[PDB]
């Protein structure tokens, strides 16, 4: 973005400073789900299938 300046002679005027603004974009902490099945519970495959 720029300043406007007025008149024909600008020798008294500060030129516009170019400012190279930057927008950050960042990952969150990863989101997870945890469950467990014991070696008895794993005998029924619907537990893994439905929990997945």
């Amino acid at each position: 973005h720029m300043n406007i300046e007025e008149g024909l002679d600008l020798s008294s005027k500060t030129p516009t400073a170019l400012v190279q603004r930057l927008v950050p974009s960042v990952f969150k902490e990863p989101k997870n789900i945890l469950y467990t099945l014991d070696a008895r519970e794993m005998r029924d495959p619907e537990h893994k299938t439905e929990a997945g």
Binding site: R40, E41, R43, D44, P45
Partner: protein
């Protein structure tokens, strides 16, 4: 005498007879495979009917 080198001759593929539990009541008992997914769903208890 003429002082030959001695060696250890170990036959690692051959075993002395050792000891064994006879297992004969288990050998003569009835054996049953009730089904693993079903026993999990049943909570590791099974029922069978007696005669009228």
């Amino acid at each position: 005498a003429n002082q030959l080198a001695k060696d250890l001759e170990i036959m690692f593929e051959n075993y002395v007879e050792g000891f064994e539990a006879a297992c004969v009541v288990s050998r003569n008992a009835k054996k049953f495979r009730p089904g693993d997914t079903a026993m999990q769903r049943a909570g590791d208890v099974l029922y069978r009917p007696q005669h009228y």
